[PDB]
Design a protein around this nucleic acid. Structure first.
Ligand SMILES: [Mg+2]
Ligand SMILES: [Mg+2]
Length: 342
DNA sequence: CTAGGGTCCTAGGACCC
DNA sequence: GGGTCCTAGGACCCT
């Protein structure tokens, strides 16, 4: 009863696309991200930039201190979406059991596959080769009996490689696995776990489930399970979008309601255009707004509402402005919609 | 020197039983 | 008191 899960993951995705489309960017340090003047961050970087320490989510000013010649690109999201659609269609040549997680990666359940004599190792390799043909981008892959190990495995031999974890290999792999490598255990959790002496899955195996449940709730059950290679989550090909949002961080903090309202007037057409692609009649379940202040606290207020409406978003933003700003400056304004259930 | 696109979980009061 | 909805906040995911 052992499944075969593939996780496929594009290498330096946004950057790989810009270098394919402009070969002049191949050997110099490049990064997709907002300028230092726009108070931006790095979305991703190529390997020449990463050598300097440039990483995703790094503030762009820090990226530039590490790497003064970093070439900064704004991003061509239709080009990334196009490559994304292409690799998903390549995935469909092998199975319909496809769960995309973002533009550039998916899980594949090839347990019941007929291709490559049932070899998941060879399927992953054929998919990676096919993506390099046809798109001229490289992908890495991970093969394992459950999702999270497959996703960990696709990181271990990148770029342009893969890694297979067999059931017999799972116990040795887990013993020294840092908890922070499990998808969904982030910096805050890893720090709480470290402070109680839990660094690796081997550390957590020596823990009582009941204690984990008390100290972490349902997360503690996930931790206990994952530390044993237990991950019964099925590959789900029927997930649907639940929200759509449009927000912007300004280059300077704003301090006047007129500035905030002016921001909303530019954001609203974008939100309407993106909703309409998926919901022509603009019918929704909730809509709402987001402010982030200069102390980086952020607040949202959203409410049941039947149909995208600009004035109500202005009105709600006005209240949030008056009622929870407390005289602080505002670095970000955002709009938001929750989509109807079906 | 701190983005923009999202998902999922938690938690208190409202409302319903 | 138990479901479920409503809303807010936050950890976390991707690039
Ligand atoms: Mg990637
Ligand atoms: Mg990815």
């Amino acid at each position: 009863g052992s499944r075969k899960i593939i996780h496929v993951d594009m290498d330096c995705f946004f950057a790989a696309v810009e270098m394919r489309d402009n070969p002049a960017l191949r050997d110099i340090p490049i990064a997709i991200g907002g300028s230092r003047e726009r108070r931006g961050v790095i979305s991703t970087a190529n390997y020449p930039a990463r050598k300097f320490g440039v990483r995703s989510a790094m503030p762009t000013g820090m990226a530039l201190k590490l790497c003064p010649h970093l070439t900064l690109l704004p991003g061509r999201f239709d080009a990334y979406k196009e490559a994304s659609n292409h690799i998903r269609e390549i995935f469909s040549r092998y199975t319909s059991r496809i769960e995309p997680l973002s533009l550039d990666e998916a899980y594949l359940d090839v347990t019941d596959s007929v291709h490559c004599h049932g070899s998941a190792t060879l399927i992953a390799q054929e998919i990676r080769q096919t993506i390099f043909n046809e798109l001229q981008l490289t992908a890495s892959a991970g093969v394992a009996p459950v999702k999270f190990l497959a996703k960990i495995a696709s990181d271990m031999n990148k770029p342009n490689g893969q890694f297979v974890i067999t059931p017999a290999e799972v116990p040795a792999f887990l013993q020294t696995l840092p908890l922070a490598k499990i998808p969904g255990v982030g910096k805050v959790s890893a720090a709480k776990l470290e402070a109680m002496g839990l660094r690796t899955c081997g550390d957590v195996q020596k823990c009582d489930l009941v204690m984990l449940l008390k100290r972490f709730g349902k997360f503690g059950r996930i931790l206990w399970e994952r530390s044993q290679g237990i991950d019964e989550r099925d590959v789900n090909s029927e997930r649907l979008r639940k929200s759509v949002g449009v927000e912007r961080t300004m280059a300077e903090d704003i301090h006047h309601w007129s500035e905030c309202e002016a921001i909303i007037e530019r954001l609203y057409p974008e939100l309407e255009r993106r909703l309409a692609k998926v919901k022509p009649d603009l019918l929704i379940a909730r809509q709402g707004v987001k402010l982030k202040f200069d102390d980086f606290q952020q607040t949202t207020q959203e409410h049941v509402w039947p149909r995208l409406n600009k004035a109500d978003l202005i009105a709600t933003a006005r209240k949030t402005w008056d009622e929870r700003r407390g005289g602080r400056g505002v670095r970000l304004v955002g709009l938001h919609v929750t989509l109807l259930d079906p």
